[PDB]
């Protein structure tokens, strides 16, 4: 029984219900994320930016079942091309816009990774990715507007791979949290 989340706190409560079991109804999770109307006052505590790159701000650890985090993208900040470590990954825009570029998994042959598609994710929209869909890069291409996004990963993961667009070669990278539960974590 999916009801509209009234607030971020209500969304979190609903997510704990949707992840109470061992499987994930992706379409329901995506729908409830989309239905939460971003309210900046509710997530200001987590919106901690860094001047030089995007930050990852942990909001909730789920039932051990998921990481819910807010990513804060300064103007021009973007990610590597990366995978999602065999997890579901949902990305909902809370403020601004992000460009998502999709790539196929590289072949063993060292070649340039050519994008398969791109799209512009707009405020309140929720995208979904997993490794079977492909790899992606997420960018705030704005020169004037920060972006803020709400990400949910299940199962949680703390490492992923970055892919070199020139060759397809990958390297393992550990996620660092800029803050946890509103507290800066140097
Ligand atoms: Fe991603």
17: nearest Cα among 57, 59, 65: 65
- Cα distance between residue 49 and residue 57, in whole Å: 9
Å resolution of this model? 1.2
CA 82 to ligand 1 centroid distance, Å: 6
CA 173 to ligand 1 centroid distance, Å: 13
- Cα distance between residue 159 and residue 176, in whole Å: 9
Range of the domain at 37: 1-186
**CATH code for the domain in which residue 95 is found:** 2.60.120.10
Q: Residue 161: beta bridge partners?
A: 172
User: What secondary structure does DSSP assign to 17-28, as a single string?
Assistant: HHTSSSS--HHH
Q: Is 16 annotated as a binding residue?
A: no
Output the CA angle 21-138-37, nearest 5 degrees.
Answer: 60
- Cα distance between residue 56 and residue 135, in whole Å: 19
What sign results for the dihedral spanned by CA atoms 7, 9, 12, 16?
Answer: negative
CA 69 to ligand 1 centroid distance, Å: 12
CA 61 to ligand 1 centroid distance, Å: 18
User: How many domains does the chain contain in total?
Assistant: 1
């Amino acid at each position: 029984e999916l009801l509209k989340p009234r607030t971020l706190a209500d969304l979190i409560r609903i997510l704990h219900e949707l992840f109470a079991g061992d499987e994930v109804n992706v379409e329901e999770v995506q729908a409830v994320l989309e239905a939460y109307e971003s309210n900046p006052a509710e997530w200001a505590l987590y919106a901690k930016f860094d001047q030089y790159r995007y930050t990852r701000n942990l909001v909730d650890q789920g039932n051990g079942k998921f990481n819910l985090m807010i990513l804060c993208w300064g103007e021009g900040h973007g990610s590597s091309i990366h995978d999602h470590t065999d997890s579901h990954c949902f990305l909902k825009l809370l403020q601004g816009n992000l460009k998502e570029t999709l790539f196929d998994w590289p072949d063993k042959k060292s070649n340039e990774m050519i994008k398969k598609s791109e799209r512009t994710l707009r405020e309140n929209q929720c995208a979904y990715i997993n490794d079977s869909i492909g790899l992606h890069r997420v960018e705030n291409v704005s020169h004037t507007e920060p972006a803020v996004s709400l990400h949910l990963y299940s199962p949680p993961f703390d490492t992923c791979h970055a892919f070199d667009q020139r060759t397809g070669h990958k390297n393992k990278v550990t996620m660092t949290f800029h803050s946890k539960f509103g507290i800066r974590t140097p």
